[PDB]
Paper text:
Influenza virus replicates in the nucleus of infected cells where the heterotrimeric viral RNA-dependent RNA polymerase, with subunits PA, PB1 and PB2, is responsible for replication and transcription of the single-stranded viral RNA genome (vRNA). For influenza, cap-snatching involves the binding of host cell pre-mRNAs via their 5′ cap structure to the PB2 subunit of the polymerase followed by cleavage at nucleotides 10–13 by an endonuclease activity which resides in the PA subunit of the polymerase. The endonuclease domain is at the N-terminus of the PA subunit and has a core fold similar to other two-metal dependent nucleases of the PD…D/E…K superfamily. Here we describe high resolution X-ray co-crystal structures of the 2009 pandemic H1N1 (pH1N1) PA endonuclease domain with a series of specific inhibitors, including four diketo compounds and a green tea catechin, all of which chelate the two critical manganese ions in the active site of the enzyme.
Co-crystals with compounds R05-2 and R05-3 were obtained with native protein in the P212121 space-group with four molecules in the asymmetric unit. All diketo inhibitors co-ordinate the two metal ions in the same manner as described for DPBA and refinement is consistent with the presence of two bound manganese ions as confirmed by anomalous scattering. For R05-02 electron density for the arms is not well-defined in all four copies in the asymmetric unit, although the configuration of the compound is unambiguous and consistent in each copy. The active site cavity of the endonuclease is quite voluminous, presumably because it has to accommodate at least two nucleotides either side of the cleavage site, with the manganese ions at its back. As shown in the superposition of Figure 5A, the metal chelating moiety of the three diketo and EGCG inhibitors binds in a similar orientation to the manganese ions (although compound R05-2 is slightly tilted) but the two ‘arms’ of each compound are inserted into combinations of different active site ‘pockets’, denoted pockets 1 to 4. Compound R05-2, which differs from R05-1 and R05-3 in the point of substitution on the piperidinyl ring occupies pocket 3 and, uniquely, pocket 1. Pocket 1 allows stacking on Phe105 and is uniquely observed with the chlorobenzene of R05-2. In fact, position 20 is an alanine in the pH1N1 strain used in this work and in most recently circulating A strains. These observations can be explained by the fact that the cyclohexane group of R05-2 that stacks on Tyr24 in pocket 3 is also in close proximity to the side-chain of Ala20 which precedes Tyr24 by one turn in helix α2. The absence of such additional stabilising interactions probably explains why the electron density for this arm of R05-2 is generally weak. Surprisingly, the configuration of L-742,001 is quite different from that we observe for R05-2.
Numbering used by the authors: -1 to 64, 69 to 139, 141 to 197
Write the structure that this text describes.
Amino acid sequence: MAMEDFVRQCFNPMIVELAEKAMKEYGEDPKIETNKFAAICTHLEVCFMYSDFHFIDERGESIIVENALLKHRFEIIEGRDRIMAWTVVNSICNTTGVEKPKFLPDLYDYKENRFIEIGVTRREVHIYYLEKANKIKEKTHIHIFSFTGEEMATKADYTLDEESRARIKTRLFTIRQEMASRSLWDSFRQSERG
Ligand SMILES: O=C(O)/C(O)=C/C(=O)C1(Cc2ccc(Cl)cc2)CCN(CC2CCCCC2)CC1
Ligand SMILES: [Mn+2]
Ligand SMILES: [Mn+2]
């Protein structure tokens, strides 16, 4: 199996289409930078999984419920074009009064009233965390996940319940096991760069 076919069989076609456009528009070919194609899809998938099933009930408390339900706990900013991402961020700042970040985050959490930056790493978790805290310098909460099961989050506050975190980590565990059984893991593990 080529990594390219792996990606197209592993991820939802919606994630794949978004990832393909992002690479071409930035001048990269998903048929050439295949590990980067798989990394883009993975990060996107985790941002969507992170918002999945989370709403805010009548008490303003966080509920899980698995479109038709309109009180979402997170606004998804990743995946949008920059015009619309900045439009959503401004409207959130306009209406909750949080500070406008200088870099685009991945999500807004309406319960804690903060932006969130998500990282998914195959290197030691401190690394992606540092790369991101360097640029945020910083009301933007950071949460990194790894393919080994470790996480690192600002002030050791993981935002989500244990079960949602275990679902993300299970998904990453499966993605690693299936790449490994096809001899793709080693190359993917080595390709991440700072
Ligand atoms: O690094 C992350 O984990 C992450 O979520 C990054 C981002 O959202 C991008 C912006 C960014 C840049 C710096 C920081 Cl600290 C935070 C966000 C980087 C390139 N992204 C687009 C990317 C798609 C593939 C081709 C190259 C550009 C979008 C904005
Ligand atoms: Mn992002
Ligand atoms: Mn991110």
